[PDB]
């Protein structure tokens, strides 16, 4: 592997565009601060039946050490168009491209959430957001970063919540995460947190779909109501105390597709987690829209 | 930067149900490569999770180089390579003198005490119990010291895998072990250590005499002894390995026999600690 170009740097570590046997690959180099995400992602990618067109493709994971220095690498497919967050900054969507994106995300999420016997455990992501979705050259997306994932099997009644003090991205946390009332030993609780975050992603995408010559600028969820670099408490205030949800631009109600998407995202945002749609129902609804 | 991950596999040095171990070459140096069967993936996951928690570095612990998952899934553990092989291998083709026998057993005690001890701080470690100590899980280094290998069953203060039945302590065989008490697992390691000390002491020459290499309980259980075979010997009959008369003519072997007795008490809380074993060994000879 030759590391060519740094494509991301934060507290998790860095991601590099790398060359391997002539092909681009993505190399995530973890900080020791996030070593538990490296191990969790490795446990999740050990599932051969995780493999799916809308899940970021695994190549290898390695821990290498000499003396007191440890290197933690995750190597995946490389998507040169980058994340959905990057794509939406500068590009607008037509109806077909908007539905293709959101159906591909629903398809990946339903794949994660549903157990296959024989297989793959049921999986909840816990950090779904537009920076954790990659855009592929076919116009479908794939879901990335399983470092916070929770696994469940109904066949053995086993829940595996892993060992990771990391929490989800604050801007996308559901009300029950922000108020810390979430039932921690309930697998359905985790799926419902993913559905809340999916609704926010739907909103980010729909804003960029043109209708009647109008589009909204890219904004992240709750851009207008919290400080820059919002705290956990900043998010709790708007989501839990103020009962805020992302505003639906009135121009959407002129367009059948955006009217349907607004209905879908509202059914992701109930404060009652058990009222929210399932990923399978979202996928079926998006298979029927326009 | 170009990261070279070119490992060449040269010769297979071990093959079991676990998988295989190869002598390999990495940047001109010998490394050992363990290739796991999918049947024993939990052992790779446990050892990897442990090393991702605490990067153990100790002269008497097999040196960690890398843990690799490649996409079925292939799971590889890469360590230092010890050309003299396992203590089990080594004791079949050599006898020992007083100095080499003590250096072997004190190095094992040193590795085990390092596993067992909690050290506070950024630079520290959780306490660890091995749970499968035996002569095949100890390697002989060129300098005459040993190192402990295989943390697949280790616990920090796997899965279908259980300890090697020949070396199981009485409380494991009678299922009385207090499973939520970390000290219980240390005491299981001390039992197994005592058996290893017996295996090594047999091969130490005194007055021109040596015993043949044998595994513990060779005279009272079959090959691949069952759980019931072991329970009847160790729990019901309370048998222990034989101390030959000739040891009692040798001050070193007399001291070693006393030490192994203090590793084999039926009551696990009566057994010596690894630290107390080290101290005793430093005062022999
Ligand atoms: C695991 O295995 C082996 C690896 C290597 C090896 C090869 N390339 C680069 C490195 C390296 C360089 C520099 C740092 C540090 C420098 C100080 N600070 C800034 C943090 C980072 C870390 C690591 C290494 C250690 C050599 C070995 O020996 C020949 C190994 O053993 C077989
Ligand atoms: C989310 O998580 C993971 C993602 C990836 C990954 C895979 N393909 C492509 C990328 C990418 C490439 C390029 C850009 C551009 C965007 C715009 N521009 C201003 C600079 C950079 C962004 C992103 C990434 C980040 C790999 C990972 O692991 C190896 C991930 O972690 C699991
Ligand atoms: C117990 O466990 C592990 C052990 C090892 C390991 C490390 N050095 C050397 C060896 C070895 C080499 C050579 C022989 C024999 C064969 C050839 N003939 C010339 C006689 C000598 C035996 C043994 C091993 C098996 C590595 C492991 O992992 C990578 C182990 O698992 C954690």
UniProtKB/Swiss-Prot annotation, chain A:
Catalytic activity: L-threonyl-[receptor-protein] + ATP = O-phospho-L-threonyl-[receptor-protein] + ADP + H(+); L-seryl-[receptor-protein] + ATP = O-phospho-L-seryl-[receptor-protein] + ADP + H(+)
Keywords for this protein: ATP-binding, Disease variant, Glycoprotein, Kinase, Magnesium, Manganese, Membrane, Metal-binding, Nucleotide-binding, Phosphoprotein, Receptor, Serine/threonine-protein kinase, Signal, Transferase, Transmembrane, Transmembrane helix
Record annotation: effect of changing residue 147 to D: In FOP; variant phenotype
Tissue expression notes: Expressed in normal parenchymal cells, endothelial cells, fibroblasts and tumor-derived epithelial cells.
Cytoplasmic side: 1-290
Cofactor (UniProt): Mg(2+); Mn(2+)
Record localization: Membrane
Segments forming domain Protein kinase: 1-290
Key word Hydrolase present: no
Binding site for ATP: 7-15, 28
Main location: membrane
Active site: 127
Documented EC number(s): 2.7.11.30
GO MF annotation: an example: transmembrane receptor protein serine/threonine kinase activity
Disease: Fibrodysplasia ossificans progressiva: A rare autosomal dominant connective tissue disorder resulting in skeletal malformations and progressive extraskeletal ossification. Heterotopic ossification begins in childhood and can be induced by trauma or may occur without warning. Bone formation is episodic and progressive, leading to a debilitating ankylosis of all major joints of the axial and appendicular skeleton, rendering movement impossible.
Homology family: Belongs to the protein kinase superfamily. TKL Ser/Thr protein kinase family. TGFB receptor subfamily.
Oligomer and partners: Interacts with FKBP1A. Interacts with FCHO1. Interacts with CLU. Interacts with type II receptors AMHR2 and ACVR2A. Interacts with BMP7. Interacts with GDF2/BMP9. Interacts with BMP6 (when glycosylated); the interaction may induce HAMP expression. Interacts with TSC22D1/TSC-22.
Protein name stated in the entry: Activin receptor type-1
Species whose genome carries this gene: Homo sapiens
Protein's gene: ACVR1
From Swiss-Prot, chain B:
Function: Bone morphogenetic protein (BMP) type I receptor that is involved in a wide variety of biological processes, including bone, heart, cartilage, nervous, and reproductive system development and regulation. As a type I receptor, forms heterotetrameric receptor complexes with the type II receptors AMHR2, ACVR2A or ACVR2B. Upon binding of ligands such as BMP7 or GDF2/BMP9 to the heteromeric complexes, type II receptors transphosphorylate ACVR1 intracellular domain. In turn, ACVR1 kinase domain is activated and subsequently phosphorylates SMAD1/5/8 proteins that transduce the signal.
Annotated effect of mutating residue 1 to I: In FOP; with some atypical features
Positions with a binding annotation for ATP: 13-21, 34
Organism in which the protein naturally occurs: Homo sapiens (Human)
Membrane disposition: Single-pass type I membrane protein
GO cellular component, one term: apical part of cell
Subunit relationships: Interacts with FKBP1A. Interacts with FCHO1. Interacts with CLU. Interacts with type II receptors AMHR2 and ACVR2A. Interacts with BMP7. Interacts with GDF2/BMP9. Interacts with BMP6 (when glycosylated); the interaction may induce HAMP expression. Interacts with TSC22D1/TSC-22.
Similarity comment text for this entry: Belongs to the protein kinase superfamily. TKL Ser/Thr protein kinase family. TGFB receptor subfamily.
Catalytic site positions: 132
Catalytic activity: L-threonyl-[receptor-protein] + ATP = O-phospho-L-threonyl-[receptor-protein] + ADP + H(+); L-seryl-[receptor-protein] + ATP = O-phospho-L-seryl-[receptor-protein] + ADP + H(+)
Cofactor: Mg(2+); Mn(2+)
MF annotations from Gene Ontology: activin binding; activin receptor activity, type I; ATP binding; BMP receptor activity; cadherin binding; metal ion binding; peptide hormone binding; protein homodimerization activity
Name of the protein in its database record: Activin receptor type-1
Included stretch of the parent chain: 202 to 499 of 509
GO biological process, one term: positive regulation of intracellular signal transduction
Disease: Fibrodysplasia ossificans progressiva: A rare autosomal dominant connective tissue disorder resulting in skeletal malformations and progressive extraskeletal ossification. Heterotopic ossification begins in childhood and can be induced by trauma or may occur without warning. Bone formation is episodic and progressive, leading to a debilitating ankylosis of all major joints of the axial and appendicular skeleton, rendering movement impossible.
Cytoplasmic side: 1-285
Swiss-Prot/TrEMBL keywords: ATP-binding, Disease variant, Glycoprotein, Kinase, Magnesium, Manganese, Membrane, Metal-binding, Nucleotide-binding, Phosphoprotein, Receptor, Serine/threonine-protein kinase, Signal, Transferase, Transmembrane, Transmembrane helix
Principal location class: membrane
Residues annotated as domain Protein kinase: 7-285
Gene: ACVR1
Coiled coil region boundaries: none
Disulfide bonds: none
Phenotype for residue 124 to R: In FOP; variant phenotype
């Amino acid at each position: 592997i030759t590391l060519l170009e740094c494509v991301g740097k934060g507290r998790y570590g860095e991601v590099w565009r790398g060359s391997w046997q002539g092909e681009n690959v993505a190399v995530k180099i973890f900080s020791s601060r996030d070593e538990k995400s490296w191990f969790r992602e490795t446990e999740l990618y050990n599932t051969v039946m995780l493999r799916h067109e809308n899940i970021l493709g695994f190549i290898a994971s390695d821990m290498t050490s000499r003396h007191s220095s440890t290197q933690l690498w995750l190597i995946t497919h490389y998507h040169e168009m980058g994340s959905l967050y990057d794509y939406l900054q500068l590009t607008t969507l037509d109806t077909v491209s908007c539905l293709r994106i959101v159906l591909s995300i629903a398809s990946g999420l339903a794949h994660l959430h549903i157990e296959i016997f024989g297989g793959k455990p049921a999986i909840a992501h816990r950090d779904l957001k537009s920076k954790n979705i990659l855009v592929k050259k076919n116009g479908q997306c794939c879901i990335a970063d399983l470092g916070l994932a929770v696994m469940h099997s109904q066949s053995t009644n086993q829940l595996d919540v892993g060992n990771n003090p990391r929490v989800g991205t604050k801007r996308y946390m559901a009300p029950e995460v922000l108020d810390e009332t979430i039932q921690v030993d309930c697998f359905d609780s985790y799926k419902r947190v993913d559905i809340w975050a999916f609704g926010l992603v739907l909103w980010e995408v729909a804003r960029r779909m043109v209708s009647n010559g109008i589009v909204e600028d890219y904004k992240p969820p709750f851009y207008d109501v919290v400080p820059n670099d919002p705290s956990f408490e900043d998010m709790r205030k708007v989501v839990c105390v103020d009962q805020q949800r992302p505003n639906i631009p009135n121009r959407w109600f002129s367009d059948p597709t955006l009217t349907s998407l607004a209905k879908l995202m509202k059914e992701c945002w109930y404060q009652n987690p058990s009222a929210r749609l399932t990923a399978l129902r979202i996928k079926k609804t998006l298979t029927k829209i326009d």
